[PDB]
Amino acid sequence: QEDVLAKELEDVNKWGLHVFRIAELSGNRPLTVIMHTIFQERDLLKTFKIPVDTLITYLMTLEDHYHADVAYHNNIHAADVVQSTHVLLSTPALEAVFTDLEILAAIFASAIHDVDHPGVSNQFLINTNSELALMYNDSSVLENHHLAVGFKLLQEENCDIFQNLTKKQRQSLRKMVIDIVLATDMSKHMNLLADLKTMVETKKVTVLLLDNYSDRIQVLQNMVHCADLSNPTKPLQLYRQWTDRIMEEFFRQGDRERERGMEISPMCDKHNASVEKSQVGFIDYIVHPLWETWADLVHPDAQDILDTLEDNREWYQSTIPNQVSEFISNTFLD
Numbered sequence: 651q652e653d654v655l656a657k658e659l660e661d662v663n664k665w666g667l668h669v670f671r672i673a674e675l676s677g678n679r680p681l682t683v684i685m686h687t688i689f690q691e692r693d694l695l696k697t698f699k700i701p702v703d704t705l706i707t708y709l710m711t712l713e714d715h716y717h718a719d720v721a722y723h724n725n726i727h728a729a730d731v732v733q734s735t736h737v738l739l740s741t742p743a744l745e746a747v748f749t750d751l752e753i754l755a756a757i758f759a760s761a762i763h764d765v766d767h768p769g770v771s772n773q774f775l776i777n778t779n780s781e782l783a784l785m786y787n788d789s790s791v792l793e794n795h796h797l798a799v800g801f802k803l804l805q806e807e808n809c810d811i812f813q814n815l816t817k818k819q820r821q822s823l824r825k826m827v828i829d830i831v832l833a834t835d836m837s838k839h840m841n842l843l844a845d846l847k848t849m850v851e852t853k854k855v856t857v858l859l860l861d862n863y864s865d866r867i868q869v870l871q872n873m874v875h876c877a878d879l880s881n882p883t884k885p886l887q888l889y890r891q892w893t894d895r896i897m898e899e900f901f902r903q904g905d906r907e908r909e910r911g912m913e914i915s916p917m918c919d920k921h922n923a924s925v926e927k928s929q930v931g932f933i934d935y936i937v938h939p940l941w942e943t944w945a946d947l948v949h950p951d952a953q954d955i956l957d958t959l960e961d962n963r964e965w966y967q968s969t970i971p972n973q974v975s976e977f978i979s980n981t982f983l984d
């Protein structure tokens with residue numbers, strides 16, 4: 651079993667890693683094994699003096715607080731986002747741009763970015779006056795929760811993977827991670843994109859040049875957001891699994907809404923769905939504009955990704971046998 655898992659992990663630097671296969675092979679520990687592998691590849695254990703047993707212990711704990719019963723926002727998604735971020739960080743256009751701390755921050759942010767997700771949206775949690783929305787005053791509810799849990803777990807037995815950073819490194823890392831995970835709130839998408847556009851419009855090269863924290867963090871925020879929205883850019887056999895999972899999760903939310911006598915949210919009604927037209931819309935209004943801008947920023951490194959995305963769009967379009975627009979307006983605008 652171990653041998654086969656090792657063969658699959660050889661694709662860790664490649665877009666299109668077989669993450670589901672890794673999940674089955676690892677006993678449903680894709681986050682732990684992927685993070686460990688990445689930490690080895692990038693030499694982050696040596697650089698930040700992270701004892702290996704402490705890493706494994708934190709990763710297993712973090713993984714356990716992802717909900718296996720949630721079809722999309724689970725540990726497999728977290729592993730995917732981590733690995734996608736890891737690839738993006740290695741793009742030629744960003745060679746030697748980020749420090750090791752900034753690299754650690756982006757990867758860690760990716761690992762924790764949806765931890766303890768309950769399988770329902772911010773808007774559902776607000777509309778039901780949930781405990782979470784009450785705790786966080788209706789703003790970036792889940793994202794604030796992912797951060798609090800992700801950090802709190804460092805305090806469990808033998809979990810403090812940052813015990814040998816300096817006080818200043820710990821503060822800087824904490825701040826970057828917060829900035830990154832809060833930018834994963836989907837309602838911030840337009841603002842992020844506008845900023846990313848501006849950065850492209852004024853980019854300097856020699857490889858990209860980034861003079862200040864503000865510019866660097868912005869790129870990391872967009873990078874992890876791209877990773878979060880990367881499913882339609884993946885080989886189609888992966889994409890389609892992600893699509894089935896997110897629709898399952900949406901339909902379960904709609905069943906909860908139905909049982910409570912609420913209006914069923916867009917995309918959440920299993921009795922009235924258009925899976926294929928909705929993906930086309932998702933790509934045209936959100937994913938393609940974002941990734942076309944990321945591709946400009948890193949031109950020409952992301953060309954294959956863009957091409958796959960455009961092929962994947964045609965496929966969903968070719969398999970077609972108000973809701974999309976309502977979902978977009980409610981999800982991706984501030």
Ligand SMILES: O=C(O)Cc1ccc(Cc2cc(-c3cccc(Cl)c3)nc(C(F)(F)F)c2)cc1
Nearest residue numbers: 771836881882892893896917928931932977981
């Ligand atoms: O954060 C939130 O408030 C809710 C929310 C926003 C973004 C996502 C990601 C996602 C979204 C979609 C999708 C499906 C139908 C329509 C549209 Cl517009 C997008 N699809 C996929 C795909 F790629 F995995 F299939 C993934 C999941 C939840």
Ligand SMILES: [Mg+2]
Nearest residue numbers: 763764834835
């Ligand atoms: Mg999230």
Ligand SMILES: [Zn+2]
Nearest residue numbers: 711714715803
């Ligand atoms: Zn716990």
Ligand SMILES: [Zn+2]
Nearest residue numbers: 731763764878
């Ligand atoms: Zn996510």
